[PDB]
């Protein structure tokens, strides 16, 4: 079964400057700004763009060791990034995949908005405990504010 999740938040960073850092160069930043959450983001197969398979390795002590994601779309113009979690972590018998779309839109006051949609494809008709959803919301908040804090500490970075 498919179970749909949505969440919206804001950042003080402009949409373009945030998309360049939080999405395009997120492989570099996430182990650098939030090492307590992500140890490394290995790019197993691909050219960054669609079809790419990243290996996000986690520090030992977190509930999961790693996950492997697949890049589905990188919209450099409208600031969209749809990717799918396909292996590792919560994925297995009771969950097929987690498809995620992140869009960043600019706000008039110079900031930005993050629309975050989660699409959980459960095998059969199993439920999804909030612990997995709560872990994803906390993970998104942690990485967003870490890159945000990095972009505030270095006003030069990413133009």
């Amino acid at each position, epitope marked *: 079964g498919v179970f749909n999740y949505e969440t919206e938040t804001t950042s003080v960073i402009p949409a373009a400057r945030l998309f360049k850092a939080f999405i395009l160069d997120g492989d570099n930043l996430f182990p650098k700004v939030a090492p307590q959450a992500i140890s490394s983001v290995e790019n197993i197969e691909g050219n960054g763009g669609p079809g790419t398979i990243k290996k996000i390795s986690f520090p030992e002590g977190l509930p999961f060791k790693y996950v492997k994601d697949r890049v589905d779309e990188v919209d450099h113009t409208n600031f969209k990034y749809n990717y799918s979690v396909i292996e590792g972590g919560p994925i297995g018998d009771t969950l097929e995949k987690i498809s995620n779309e992140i869009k960043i839109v600019a706000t008039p006051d110079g900031g930005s908005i993050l629309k975050i949609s989660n699409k959980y494809h459960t095998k059969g008709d199993h439920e999804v405990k909030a612990e997995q959803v709560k872990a994803s919301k906390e993970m998104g908040e942690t990485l967003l504010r870490a890159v945000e*804090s990095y972009l505030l*500490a270095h006003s030069d970075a990413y133009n």
Partner: antibody
Amino acid sequence: VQLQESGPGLVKPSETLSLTCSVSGGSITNYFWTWIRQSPGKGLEWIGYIYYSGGTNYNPSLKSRVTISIDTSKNQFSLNMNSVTAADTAVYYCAGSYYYGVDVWGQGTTVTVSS
Amino acid sequence: EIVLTQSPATLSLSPGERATLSCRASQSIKSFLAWYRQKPGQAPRLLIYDASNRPTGIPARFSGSGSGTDFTLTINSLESEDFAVYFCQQRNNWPFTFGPGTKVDIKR
């Protein structure tokens, strides 16, 4: 950016420590708002830190009895440590942290746990 | 939690000499070490972040280096105003943890 502690300097054992820190000279968005204490026995100790989005992160040795809250409208954040004992007597620093470390600090307020 | 060890506890140097402080971590903190100075009666001030980089306003006479488990802070041309206790901090794994501190006393 400016931070000022305000809270009781004397807390009786098993009661609740409560501290508040006022942010001025800068937006509530800038830092990871942080609580750090310093005691002779334990040295410098990370209590926890809160984003302006509400996401907290607590030290496991103190997560059992520590809650950190933020009120972005009043430009304030708070620390609440209940069931305090003499092992909680320390100078408490409210502070603002970047991703790389604590960038700005409060003056520090001395809390004594005593009967 | 990752346990940071600082060596030595106390060193006593004349002004103008080079001060070399050491920090050791029970596990690998890749490059995520910070150095703070705490002059008496004051809140600590960050000097080195991510083990070699220097925040804006910290003079060039402070530098850090190291990776893995062994890092060192170096103060070129000590001043009498450099009398303080210097702590190292890892941010690799929560909880972030400090070292016991190295006190730099100024010879006179």
